[PDB]
Amino acid sequence: MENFQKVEKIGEGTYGVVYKARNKLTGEVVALKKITAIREISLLKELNHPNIVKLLDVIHTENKLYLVFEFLHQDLKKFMDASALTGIPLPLIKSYLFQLLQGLAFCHSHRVLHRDLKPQNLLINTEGAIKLADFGLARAFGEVVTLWYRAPEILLGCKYYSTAVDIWSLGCIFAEMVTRRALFPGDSEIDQLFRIFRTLGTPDEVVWPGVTSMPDYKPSFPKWARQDFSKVVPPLDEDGRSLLSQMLHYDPNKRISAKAALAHPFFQDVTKPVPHLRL
Ligand SMILES: O=C(Nc1cc(C2CC2)n[nH]1)c1ccccc1
DSSP states (O other): SSEEEEEEEEEESSSEEEEEEEEEETTTTEEEEEOOHHHHHHHTTSSSOTTTEEEEEEEEEETTEEEEEEEEEHHHHHHHHHHHTTOOOOHHHHHHHHHHHHHHHHHHTTTOOOOOGGGGGGOOOTSSSSOOOSSSSHTOOOOOOTTTTTOHHHHOSSSOTTTTTHHHHHHHHHHHHHHSSSOOSSSSHHHHHHHHHHOOOOOOTTTTTTTGGGGTOTSSSSOOOOOOOOOOHHHOHHHHHHHHHHHHSSTTSSOHHHHHHSSGGGGGGGOOOOOOOOO
């Protein structure tokens, strides 16, 4: 854009290139993303919450779309890589999960889904805050994209997925912060689906009614037994493992909502620590 002075290139997203920019008039530092869609994006400008990255403006010029966002100094992916030797302390993991669930509860109450939650679109500041970026952009529009945080209902071909997909994604991220390794690191749709099955057990009509009738379900899927959560996410306590299991329930209807997750005993001693950020 003409009104913005590009500082540097942040990275490459799912829709386009993300830039760090400065407004020539106001002097504000922003994040500029270069991409019926116009109306859906304009609805997200009103979706404001302290845990949702603020969409400042929507610029439509020369058949190209520019999305102006609030700037945050680091993403969760880079923060995880920078804390891989010592580990992100548990009180900070709990704070992050609590704040992200608050942001999810807000958007979900307004019927807005993320659909593509990953450590890369979770942004953090020096104040101990964590924010969700690119919310609702999947409904508006539609490099290898990661399947690691994708819910099984999406992998099994369900066209009409719910808010429960974001809970699954956040549960995979929760597990990753604790273990310092991706929960389900799939490199294909079937590898993703089979890694889920190997850990949580191949779903049947008992744990998930209607799973055998799903578009991409195949009766030939190998039958693996469920592994205990104590083996999946050590040294996470009983409260955390219980919340994780409810966030990772196969059936989208049994899967805990963001609002109910905020009331879970794991958040009894939740606080808001300040992270160690070297920018
Ligand atoms: O992504 C970063 N910043 C950012 C991105 C965003 C919006 C465009 C979604 N706001 N702030 C970032 C990551 C690492 C280092 C510096 C900046």
